[PDB]
């Protein structure tokens, strides 16, 4: 599956962020390799290609296809020289012929790039290309992470080790400002395109979630690469939430049994707005009710009355509860109890009827789940249905976001699933009875814990948080942090404090925080556990796109973690900005 070896791509490079030992480098260039060109063929890019002209309705002309797999393969082959290269110094380091060498494979290969790279955004294809420039761009900038971590001892002078450093910053920003433009463009295509609406965001959503993982996922590796700003190991999240298609039911095609997208609403909003929840603090799924109905207006089978889901935020257990629908009319329901659990797996039966009035149902619904201690657990209800067989559609959440479990699973494994359910929306409907769901996903790479790693970078998103002010600070989307950030508006803040945080750890921890933030004008930030505050600059003009940088806290004296830690905004000593936070980073002392 091309999903699936892009879920492993993103989750291989995840799994190295931040490490810097040639022995490791060169495992991660062999798996990588494989990853991308399995047996040395160029098949996943050519998956690549048809999947994203699939998505978005537009088709790359054969002169334009030919000329970026043509390149891929020159990229393939001097990768593989490159790692040769650099497998034979690592071994004989001494050996100055070898340093030679592996420089000359180096300079060779980046330049490469540099003259490939205009392949995979040829004028006019920019959007079906973009998962290969995407997935292009994230080896160049890996690449480039090379001369940083092993030029000087290839030989490499400082100037041009710093050259490289300062190419390798340009091209994270040309690289991901592409992929954001040509993903944002792509999904503006689909919420205009001509179609009945249910039909039309169906095929956005599946854009927008499709993408995320072969594409956005990527982007906040980007700065990571930048090994003076990460010199070691670096733990990162994606906090964003994908939905998978709407269990509707499709493919039958008969008057009676039509597809649901004709009963969705005729407003793009409508739909978005209740399918795809506001931008949070991050959420896990630990209740969903179902209340259903049993009607008879031939066939005979449930419908959804309403739905409830209830979360918690991390290292909190106030409860947080959405309804949908009602409970009114119901004489069936079931609570699925999920607090502990990674679901990471969904099978569902949708039906529908079109009579005197047009119903829509999902009867079954089976979860599959895996709590801490690595024990596998099932639950499901299935309710009344006489509708033939061959007229419903079964559906299994792991099509659309593949699994692959060992004999033994283990929670938390991303090698065995990458997503875990996260939410339960609907479609807004126009007219007729019966819930249509949407199941909302999250990446299992977000751990329940806040976790403090000792020898190594923890980079925790704000959205991590379980508590914000209750005024001048809001949680807004951001395409390429890999899930929300905050906003803070100064003059807007009742007091300082901006978020709480619970975090986990054995011992006392000697910390410095390291905020990557974006800022309209200048002030002073403050964390829990650190005695001094620290004054910070703009990054930004109002309005213009977001740029950050880092500000770090501790570099007067190492602080201490507390347990219980918040984010303050001095308002006192503030301008009257805007303040953007995405992570938080803990930076272990010695």
Same mark, same amino acid.
């Given at each position: ?35 991308? +060109? ?22 790359? %002309? ?63 294809? &920019? ?38 450093? *300062? ?14 433009? +040509? ?5 503006? !295509? ?14 956005? *959503? ?32 994606? #906090? ?58 031939? /066939?005979?089978?449930a419908i959804w009355t309403g739905h409830s889901v209830v979360t918690?935020? %991390? ?5 947080? %509860?959405?309804?949908?629908? %009602? ?18 797996? #969904? ?10 009035? +047009? ?13 801490? @201690?690595?024990?596998?657990?099932? /639950? ?41 359910? @996260? ?9 007729g009875s019966g819930t249509i769901p949407v199941l909302g996903w999250?990446?299992? @790479? ?11 970078? #923890?980079?925790?998103?704000?959205? !991590?948080?379980? &508590? ?113 936070? /995405?992570?938080?980073e803990f930076i272990p002392v010695v």
């Amino acid at each position: 599956s091309m999903i699936f070896s892009s879920i492993s791509i993103i989750r291989t490079f995840m799994g190295f962020a931040g490490h810097g030992t040639a022995g490791g480098i060169i495992g991660l260039f062999t798996e990588v390799l494989r990853l991308l +060109w399995p047996n040395k063929q160029n098949d996943l890019w050519e998956s690549f290609m048809n999947e994203v002209e699939a998505l978005i309705n537009q088709e790359i %002309t054969e002169a334009v296809v030919s000329k970026a797999l043509s390149e891929l393969e020159g990229l393939r082959n001097a990768l593989e020289g490159y790692t040769s290269a650099l497998e034979a110094w690592q071994n004989n380091r001494s050996d100055k012929l070898k340093q030679l060498l592996v420089y000359e494979r180096f300079v060779s290969t980046e330049n490469l790039f540099k003259f490939a790279m205009p392949s995979f955004r040829s004028v006019g294809f &920019e959007g079906p290309l973009l998962t290969v420039y995407a997935q292009a761009a994230n080896l160049h900038l890996f690449l480039l992470k090379n001369a940083e971590l092993f030029g000087a001892e290839w030989g490499m002078q400082q100037y041009e080790i710093d050259l490289f450093y *300062n190419e390798q910053k340009g091209y994270v920003e040309e690289y991901t400002d592409h992929c954001v433009k +040509w993903y944002k463009e792509g999904l503006n !295509k689909l919420k205009n395109a001509s179609g009945v609406k249910g039909k039309v965001w169906e095929n956005y *959503n599946r854009f927008r979630r499709e993408m995320t993982i072969m594409v956005l996922d990527l982007l906040p590796l980007f700065p990571i690469y930048d090994a003076r700003t990460y010199p070691m190991e670096t733990v990162t999240e994606l #906090t964003r939430q994908i939905f998978t298609d709407p269990i509707g039911l499709t493919g039958i095609n008969e008057t009676k049994y039509p597809d649901w997208y004709g009963a969705a609403s005729s407003e793009f909003v409508l739909i978005e707005n209740r399918a795809i929840p506001k931008p949070g603090l991050f959420q896990w799924l630990t209740k969903i009710n179902v209340r259903a109905r049993v009607v008879e207006p031939n /066939d005979r089978f449930a419908i959804w009355t309403g739905h409830s889901v209830v979360t918690q935020y %991390t290292k909190s257990t106030t409860e947080n %509860t959405f309804n949908y629908g %009602t409970s009114s009319g119901s004489t069936l329901s079931h609570t699925f109890d999920l607090l502990s659990k990674d679901i990471y797996q #969904t099978y569902s039966i949708a039906a529908a009827n079109k009579s005197a009035t +047009w119903y829509q149902a999902v009867p079954l619904l089976r979860l599959y789940g895996i709590n801490s @201690s690595n024990v596998l657990s099932e /639950d499901a209800f299935s309710f009344s249905n006489n509708i033939p067989s061959s007229k419903c559609k079964s559906t299994y959440s792991s099509d659309q976001l593949p699994i692959e479990l060992l004999d033994e699973p283990i929670y938390g494994d991303l090698e065995e699933y990458g997503h875990r359910l @996260s939410y339960v929306s609907e479609i807004f409907k126009e007219t007729g009875s019966g819930t249509i769901p949407v199941l909302g996903w999250t990446h299992v @790479s977000v751990r329940p814990d806040n976790k403090l790693y000792p020898d190594k970078i #923890t980079q925790i998103p704000a959205v !991590k948080a379980f &508590e914000t002010n209750t005024a001048g600070v809001e949680i807004i989307d951001s395409a390429s942090t890999g899930g929300p950030i905050l906003k803070i508006v100064n003059n807007n803040l009742p007091s300082n404090q901006v978020f709480r945080m619970r975090l986990s750890f054995s011992e006392p921890q000697k910390i410095k925080v390291r905020v990557r933030y974006a800022a309209t004008g200048d002030g002073v930030m403050s964390f829990s556990g650190i005695a001094h505050d620290e004054y910070f600059t703009a990054t930004m003009k109002e309005g213009e796109a977001l740029k950050y940088s880092y500000l770090t806290m501790g570099n007067d004296y190492a602080g201490t973690a507390a347990e219980l830690s918040m984010l303050y905004i001095i308002k006192a000593n503030t301008s009257n900005c805007t303040i953007y936070i /995405d992570k938080i980073e803990f930076i272990p002392v010695v």
